[PDB]
Amino acid sequence: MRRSKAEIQRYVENAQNSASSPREKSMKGFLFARLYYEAKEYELAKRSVSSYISVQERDPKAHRFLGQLFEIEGNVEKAVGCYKRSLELNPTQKDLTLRIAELICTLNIKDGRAEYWVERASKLFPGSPEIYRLKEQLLSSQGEAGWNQLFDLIQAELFARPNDVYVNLKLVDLFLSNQRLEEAVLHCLKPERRALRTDIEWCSCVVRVFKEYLASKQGQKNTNMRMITKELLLAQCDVVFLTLSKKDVQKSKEALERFDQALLSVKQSVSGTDASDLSVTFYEMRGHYYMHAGTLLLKMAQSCEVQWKALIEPAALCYLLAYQVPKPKSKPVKGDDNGQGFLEELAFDRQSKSGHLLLTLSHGKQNFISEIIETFANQCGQSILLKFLFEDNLSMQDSFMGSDDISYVENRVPDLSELSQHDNGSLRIHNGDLQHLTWLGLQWHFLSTLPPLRKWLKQIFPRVPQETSRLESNIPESICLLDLEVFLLAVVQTSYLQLQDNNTTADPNRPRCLPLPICKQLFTDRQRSWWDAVYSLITKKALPGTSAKLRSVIQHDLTTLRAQEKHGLQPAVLVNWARGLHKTGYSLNSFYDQKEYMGRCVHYWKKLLPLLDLVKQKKSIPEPVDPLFKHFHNKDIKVSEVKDLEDEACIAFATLDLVDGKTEDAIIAFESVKNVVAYWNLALIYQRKAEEIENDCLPAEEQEEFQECLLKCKGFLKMICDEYSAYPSIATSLPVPVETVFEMLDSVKQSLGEAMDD
Amino acid sequence: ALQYFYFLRNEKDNQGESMFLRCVSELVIESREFDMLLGKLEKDGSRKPGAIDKFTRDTKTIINKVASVAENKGLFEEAAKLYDLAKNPDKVLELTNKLLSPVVSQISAPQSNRERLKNMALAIAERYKSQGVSAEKSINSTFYLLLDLITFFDEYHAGHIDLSFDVIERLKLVPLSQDSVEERVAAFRNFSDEIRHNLSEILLATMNILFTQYKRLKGSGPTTLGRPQRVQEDKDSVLRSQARALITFAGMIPYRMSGDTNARLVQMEVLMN
16 A cells, blocks of 8 residues: 555556546545555645545545645644534544544644533543643643643543553643642552653652652651652662663662662661661662662673673672561551562562572572671671772762671571572562573573472462363363473573573673673563463463464464474474473373373374474474574484384373373383383383382282293393494484493393393 | 477487487477476476476476486576476575585675576575475575575675674684584584585685774774773683684694685684784
């Protein structure tokens, strides 16, 4: 529809030559004026829509287009008359009054009729930015009679849609201009202002308003004052966070100085009779100031002043202090629970991230605080921290951190149980997000231990407690926690590969996992939408009508994660997924969890079988056609393992059949399948059966069966050794190592006996 | 033509191939037309039952042999179109690489028609790979390698240095550090003749970009004219690492070229050292 003026004119003249009647010409005049507007021909569009209206006084869209063209040109009176006659013809239009108001505002001659029309539109609709701008332009040249209506409209819009940052800013500015601080304080005291905290200028205006209110009412200490101080501190922390997120150094330093000044000012009331929500928010802001000083040091190192090798230790000490900040205490007089809970969750998140960063940076330490206390008694440490942060501008007494020391807070050490508790407390308010999950997975991989994603997903999804019925079939209803764990492991592996590729250089290395203000999102919008749709479909939060669309959006990305053709990841990564699933399903000893694991593995194998056949035939590889990153051949599968992968799929089938309740059938299937992993599983099953027989009775038939099983296991180990010595391609995919195979064969031979052995 | 081919096909083989095959090959290479005789093409479609196809079979093998004869003679675009009609991604990518390899050695700036021909051939190959099954794993790897290499080549020829530097750093295939030289050598053993031959021009362009960057860094003041001393030291250290990795690669790979290329390699090694 939008092309070149020459093409538009050619299409117009072709349609005119095809039209053989003025009636049909005026009928097509609608599309004629549309193309004229797309090609920027206002006069021709106007004459076309005028002819169309003259030959047919129907369709309000044509009247709206004519009014818009008149507003673009300069026929305000004609547009007003056309809108009036259109409203008189059909009084079933709501945007016509807004169009009339826009025309009058463009004319710059406001009218009482337009004011009444906009008032009726505002009484009808709950609120709109268009009607807000219309009322602003109308009453911007009236007086107090219009100011009252504007304030009423702003209040109605704020009651309708609370997400009105610019509207709230304009209201606060109007209140400050008209000298009305009580209404501004009452508006800022709302709980939704915490979520509205998104603009640095809005946060600074809120901070100034709160400071003015405190300077005006200095002399009262009530729950309202506590809430106002907490909101002021939260706005200051948001300002500092925004300055640290954006690329600068002087602004972040000024924000940290303002935060330290506010903390020093509030320390006067901290030491008073305030020992509840005020002290809670004071400790919260102390931890936030520590983390913000660490982020400012990191930003300065990025802007190149002091290297990471010299700025990690101050950042590590700041993180340790933020972690040692005492937990939010209880309040004897309740009243601000909505803020106390938010402060407690913020403390949980801060403690979690500080402990994780300190553990990843220290690899085990706890005597640093004791050594500092025994040597410098924290005084010289705080002096060095102040000299590294604020240089020599602020003195030792002009800051709350100079008078306080490390002994002022707690002396707890980051432990695994405390870290897990803080992570659970963070998740209970995050409601499930892949970013922090990938971060925790990376932290666990750096600490060299398996991450407990099972309990995390169980507490995230209240509908799937590791108990599902649908296993096969590529359907969105068969979604369990295993697919989410696979996606999280994929994102973790991608982030680890990116970090390894970035660290392989002579550039000054950075600490593992950069903080949030200096680490953008690594996932994609498609993956985020798929995760959100999966969460909404599992938590039964869908709408009656959009369920099919949500299922289709989910399947659009699930067709790749379910190990099917046209991938976005890597075949080697899919093979690793299948191997890990099989290992987790074969090493445990439960029932439902193992069955679900092996069912998901069986589904993955039976869906990947075509890709295995393609790799065997040596054809196309997963080309980067889907927005799922891009890798290379270093993490790709080979061509000498397709038979091993098919045999592993058969092994998963046999294990599923065994756990279902067909031990003999699964043993027969394992014996029929020829694979080193199959023979190893057969030997393990035979050893377990021998242990069970030795624990129970030993009849003649059971003894003969045990002897036959031991002989079969010995023969399977011998043929495994023969195949490993002959075919070299089987060595590329080996389950247990050769030493483990040899020790298992030796144990089997020792349990059986000599002579009869081979 | 088909009426005469109906009589020419009655003769059996005579001293290799056949007189009928030689005649039809000469006729098709003299005519250069197949949109209705062999099959029409929208952009990368399959074959259509043409006039000769409606009477004789083995049309796929006939078209493959004709395209092979044309490639052996000296035809590129028509042979590529014929193989795209016959649906052969392996041969399509093979001829694409064979026609883009000799042009890599010379300049790649828009000065004639060879660059436009290689660009349209690369576009046809990439759209054929997107719509349908591509070639083998090694063939697709070589195709992506050549795509990235010609991209870096045109980025360097356009007059930009930072763009070439960042694309050659994001390629993740040049020797980065000493711990990466091992995997680079391990992956070098699974390359190809073209991938081993174009390394000369690749290293030449890399050393040209590195020398330009070093000259700009030397012209820029250490303390004045921007670029702080810490940034200069970091750049010098990353150049040291890159040079050490490149020289370790070139020293421990089982392949030697020429004295001039070796001298230039050591020259860039010590320049960044």
